[PDB]
Symmetry: D2
Subunit: 348 residues, 4 copies
Amino acid sequence: PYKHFMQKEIFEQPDSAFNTMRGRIDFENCVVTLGGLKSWLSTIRRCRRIIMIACGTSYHSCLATRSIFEELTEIPVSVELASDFLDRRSPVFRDDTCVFVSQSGETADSILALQYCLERGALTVGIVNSVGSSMSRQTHCGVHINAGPEIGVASTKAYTSQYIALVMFALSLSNDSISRKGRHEEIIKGLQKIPEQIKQVLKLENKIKDLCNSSLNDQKSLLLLGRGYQFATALEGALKIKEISYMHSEGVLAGELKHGILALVDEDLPIIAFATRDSLFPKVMSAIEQVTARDGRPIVICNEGDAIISHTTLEVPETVDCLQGLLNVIPLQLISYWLAVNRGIDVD
Amino acid sequence: PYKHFMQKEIFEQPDSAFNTMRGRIDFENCVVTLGGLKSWLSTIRRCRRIIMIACGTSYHSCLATRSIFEELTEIPVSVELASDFLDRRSPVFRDDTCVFVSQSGETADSILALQYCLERGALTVGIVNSVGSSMSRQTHCGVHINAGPEIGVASTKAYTSQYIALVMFALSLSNDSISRKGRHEEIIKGLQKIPEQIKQVLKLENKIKDLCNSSLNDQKSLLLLGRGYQFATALEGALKIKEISYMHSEGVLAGELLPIIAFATRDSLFPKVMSAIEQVTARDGRPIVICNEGDAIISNDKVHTTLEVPETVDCLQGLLNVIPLQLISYWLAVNRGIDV
Amino acid sequence: PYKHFMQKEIFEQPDSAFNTMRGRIDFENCVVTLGGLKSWLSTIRRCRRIIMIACGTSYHSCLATRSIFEELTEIPVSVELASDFLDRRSPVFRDDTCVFVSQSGETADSILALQYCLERGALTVGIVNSVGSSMSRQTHCGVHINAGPEIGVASTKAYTSQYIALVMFALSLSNDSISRKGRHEEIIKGLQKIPEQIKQVLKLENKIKDLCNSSLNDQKSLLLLGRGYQFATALEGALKIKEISYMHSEGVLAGELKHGILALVDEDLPIIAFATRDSLFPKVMSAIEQVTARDGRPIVICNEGDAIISNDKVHTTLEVPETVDCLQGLLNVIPLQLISYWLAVNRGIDVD
Amino acid sequence: GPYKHFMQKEIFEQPDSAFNTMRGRIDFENCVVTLGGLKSWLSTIRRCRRIIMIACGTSYHSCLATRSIFEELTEIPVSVELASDFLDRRSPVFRDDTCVFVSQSGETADSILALQYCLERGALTVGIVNSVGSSMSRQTHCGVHINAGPEIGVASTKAYTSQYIALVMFALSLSNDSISRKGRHEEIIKGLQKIPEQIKQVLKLENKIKDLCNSSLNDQKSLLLLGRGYQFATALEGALKIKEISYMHSEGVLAGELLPIIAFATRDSLFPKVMSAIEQVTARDGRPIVICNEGDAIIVHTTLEVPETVDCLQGLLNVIPLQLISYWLAVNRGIDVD
Ligand SMILES: CC(=O)N[C@H]1[C@@H](OP(=O)(O)OP(=O)(O)OC[C@H]2O[C@@H](n3ccc(=O)[nH]c3=O)[C@H](O)[C@@H]2O)O[C@H](CO)[C@@H](O)[C@@H]1O
Ligand SMILES: CC(=O)N[C@H]1[C@@H](OP(=O)(O)OP(=O)(O)OC[C@H]2O[C@@H](n3ccc(=O)[nH]c3=O)[C@H](O)[C@@H]2O)O[C@H](CO)[C@@H](O)[C@@H]1O
Ligand SMILES: CC(=O)N[C@H]1[C@@H](OP(=O)(O)OP(=O)(O)OC[C@H]2O[C@@H](n3ccc(=O)[nH]c3=O)[C@H](O)[C@@H]2O)O[C@H](CO)[C@@H](O)[C@@H]1O
Ligand SMILES: CC(=O)N[C@H]1[C@@H](OP(=O)(O)OP(=O)(O)OC[C@H]2O[C@@H](n3ccc(=O)[nH]c3=O)[C@H](O)[C@@H]2O)O[C@H](CO)[C@@H](O)[C@@H]1O
Ligand SMILES: N[C@H](CO)[C@@H](O)[C@H](O)[C@H](O)COP(=O)(O)O
Ligand SMILES: N[C@H](CO)[C@@H](O)[C@H](O)[C@H](O)COP(=O)(O)O
Ligand SMILES: N[C@H](CO)[C@@H](O)[C@H](O)[C@H](O)COP(=O)(O)O
Ligand SMILES: N[C@H](CO)[C@@H](O)[C@H](O)[C@H](O)COP(=O)(O)O
Ligand code: NA
Ligand code: NA
Ligand code: NA
Ligand code: NA
């Protein structure tokens, strides 16, 4: 019933999200159990630091979850792009836990980075979609995300499923803390509602098809503004637009520069801003204002009922702050898909 | 005899680079001595990790020197933008060494980041230009970079002076290792020549003026391609272009996925850089290539502009590579009638 | 009504044990709150390792609680004798948490070790009885143990109060762990019973007095056998006998050597063995059997009701209430304090 | 050979076993230590939260004798555990611990149980073992075979001094990248070069020690050994030897912290508290046996003079008269030490 595998995969997300969590979360007692990590957790905690290493959209899923790992675990977490990690010859030692995120489990730069960490004595952990792929075999332990196959060239359901797996991994690491208990529960109860909220967000597709037809198809570039939890989503949205739609795009840290890209925008170029409550910073408001003043008409992704400015609005349900990126990425997936098909591009 | 403070400050770099090292490097014996830090070095090293925290060009100087800190010290080093560091409520603890880089020592997010780290019991180190500014006073210890006052609106000499001070800090932290003695000597001997090499690089100004006179100056954006040590230079070039020239620009990790400037000096001449360049020459895209004197990155059968710079030690190459970008950003602004 | 400050201080222990815990343990909700440390706990935890540093009986209170600190916190814990720490010039750094235990807060070697750690940038924590003493002032934070003044020359109540404060510190450090909750609850409920159990143990005095009036008073040496939690108690018992009774004494790790001191002892050499359930190891039973095999007549400190040596073999028992394993040392040391005291009295020594 | 007992042979063999332990491993001219068993593991061993040395009996003493030099040269926390007590406390161990197991036999039950405990917990394990291919040798990740040759006497003698040498070489190897350590490294390496000949010289104290053991010293019930600092381990090991071989009670005491008396008063460990303890003894006219450096007048007493070596190597020489005293006290008391 679907034009492309990509469209099918986007629409499959309530199912792929549920299947990633299946058998792993007791939503009643609020307990997370990851069979592949279970016996390794005590060891994983006992590291100097966690280094998340990935390429492309998997690198984004790491940026999207870095804050929650830091918050729940109080272990240092850094996020490396695999190729740049190898280019710097970054030192790795026995006391590092290196977490490798990959949909295919076969990306050359990820495998090379893995081999480098393995040779240095680090503990290695895979978060991988292709069961028994090279990355799954070669990591010491890990989690198969169970999202099913992706045929679309750009990753959609693997991003949301990876992000969920990474959240479950952070919850697992912090499952012995009294002080964390209430935050754990909050997140777990939030995760329970994600698949249905994704169903809801997918109902934006008509408004999105209209927006592309009326304001976007014709455009050479588009700028995405985000901060905090939503900066990763701005980078991922930009990558989707670039890969699928063959249009220029850039994710920008909102309001970081006064005199930067926004002091230098046309009253014409399309701008999408993340203004959901989890990442509604004064710098995001100033960025939006600097657009409206200039007579740009921003596209605002925000939570249902919110009045961000006096523009096009795409409303999404409100979830737990660290989960909001799971909902906010979906309209960007749909935008990139429709922009591409409306240009005769094959997305499969 | 300069039109603007920015032009004066760019041309001051052989002197500011020299002044940053003055009294701190024994070039004969290859000994670095940072008075502000030396009784603190054993404690700085005894940390779980180093967090470099800064904004803007100062954040770039951190990115430009991260690899040499990690290489020489084998201490984990992460680099944070002060505002994003705060947005995440990044936990920090007694075992962190937090290194704050700031020309002014007054930038609001850098200050708030500092106070946050201090409240959490971290050791704090300032790399600061304004002596006795907030950041200078409130950090436990530090190095004044001694670049002199910087009055241009965009940072030029403070970037190259911050980068030098950071390399001296990394050398200081690693001064007890026999295995890294040769690498220390290499870098220190390389640093001695940087001021005279900056003088050489400033000799590109005429070629750069000729470039900024061309229809380059009516472009809406400029892309900069770099990788490894030169990725920070690409990000900093793009900031200068946006800040000064009012032209859009983006620094791109070369080959990871309209005028184009590509960094192709030997320190950062990766296969991915070459393939990115080839992609541009395949569509006869006429790239501007920053490369080392005498290296033909692109054949004569493709139109391209070359800006040759001296070869230095790999982790010092960014000190020279940033200079043409400073000059391009300045002359683009002048050609566009911008009072820099 | 007491003959000496030392006697009074021994018999004051139900009250001092209570006083150390007072206002710090919610026994109903099982919460420990140490005001002196509360806001420093997250920082104390964030260390490479804990170094306990002390002299004499205060050093023994560290040995007596090392295992529970290790168990509850999973942070490396080492215990140093202050003078030896200084002799080795042991390297200390910013990532070390240094814990100084001292009754007086004025012992020279403890103060020198503190200054050494302070100047090296380590976090320092005092567990001190004398309020506002040098160690109390100079440590970053700490717990005043609240045992009251100790006038006896040998430490009695400050030992049990230090030991309790250290257990409370260990509980405070591990109070965020779900997996530790049952162990915390077990220990805290145990602590609540310690003051009344100390009172029970003190009822042993008549038996001990009779024993000190025995063939025991005549001999020149006494060996103590202990393992595990009770090794510290053997060392502290030997120190008390040496310091107070002026008799030679040695605390011996039980059954460690098959042909060590026990293969050499005279039939009539006085030997005290700790055989309470918390430290009743096969090696302890081995050592005890080696003693009785040679016709030795050991004194057995064991839990109420337990038969460690057959009634067929001559031996003395001093029975003590059973408590939580890591708290048993609080009860087991009491008879040694009383033995050292009555051995001294009977030899004319003035213990004050 | 011309020796009455294996134990006597093995004592007198120490110049040779000390040399053999070092052979092929120390370049004395260039001051370079190379331990083949460790070469590829050193960078990893250094990257640990801490080092735990774990051993029994005399091997536990060799850890105490070298703890200080490990701490000094490496700035890694070093703790020393008796294997049985380590197990008794169920002391936690983790991935980030380097656990160093010292054993002559490589077969001691508590040492093997402690090794398996550490292995299951994911610690890096390092063996310092005399019997090649023994349980401890095979099952540690990496290690150094001490090359002392077979030891048949039941009190360890040559295995103590060879374990102690092996451990010092291990400490030197861990700190071989430090510029600030270089002078100290060279001092200790030049010191080690002279140890075998210095042990030859100390063995010439034998007649003086026989004279001492012919006296009423052999009729005593207890012998107290006083030491501090580097020489505390020596005092413990001396006491163990007297108990194991001589069947006389002995205790190693930390000098001046609180009957024949031996006091270690060599310059490496000549603390105020040692001098105080010695004065206490002479004040009551107790007649101490003093082990001190050649030419030193420490203070009726007996003096056993030993050559001066580097502070952290002095234990290697000081232990030798204790081994001889234990052996001749046994012979005088009619005990077959074999
Ligand atoms: C492969 C397999 O039989 N998985 C079963 C396992 O799933 P479970 O979810 O427990 O484990 P995973 O499928 O995630 O992992 C399988 C194994 O692969 C390792 N691993 C995984 C990913 C990675 O990147 N690297 C890596 O080493 C894990 O540590 C584990 O040993 O128990 C479930 C019942 O609860 C079953 O329904 C699953 O079919
Ligand atoms: C400011 C000052 O009087 N500097 C003097 C210092 O230079 P020197 O180069 O030794 O020291 P710096 O100027 O770098 O540092 C001055 C002091 O400020 C501290 N600090 C510095 C920067 C920072 O961000 N945070 C921070 O805490 C340093 O730890 C130091 O205590 O000794 C020289 C003599 O050898 C004199 O010529 C300089 O005039
Ligand atoms: C001595 C004192 O005023 N104690 C008061 C403190 O008891 P509380 O039990 O809260 O505190 P302690 O007496 O244990 O500690 C007093 C102070 O001294 C510090 N410290 C203590 C011991 C040490 O060795 N080193 C050290 O630095 C502590 O960190 C603290 O700042 O607050 C209570 C209010 O609830 C009062 O009833 C107590 O009278
Ligand atoms: C046993 C062996 O083959 N030794 C050879 C090795 O000596 P070399 O001195 O190089 O090595 P060792 O004999 O010390 O150790 C041999 C191996 O056993 C390991 N190990 C050792 C002790 C221990 O307790 N645990 C442990 O795992 C080492 O890591 C190494 O892999 O090369 C020399 C030539 O260069 C040969 O003369 C020796 O015959
Ligand atoms: N086109 C996709 C992104 O949607 C690619 O960029 C991948 O994300 C990138 O190659 C990493 O792939 P991986 O997740 O299989 O390791
Ligand atoms: N305009 C400059 C860039 O050249 C700014 O981005 C500064 O670099 C940034 O504000 C940081 O300032 P600082 O170095 O004084 O803390
Ligand atoms: N005589 C007593 C023991 O009872 C002494 O050993 C002290 O315990 C020792 O001096 C330590 O004193 P302190 O706890 O005041 O620091
Ligand atoms: N009798 C000897 C000591 O002289 C024993 O104490 C051993 O030292 C002890 O059994 C350890 O043996 P090991 O070094 O073979 O592991
Ligand atoms: Na695997
Ligand atoms: Na300062
Ligand atoms: Na204090
Ligand atoms: Na082995």
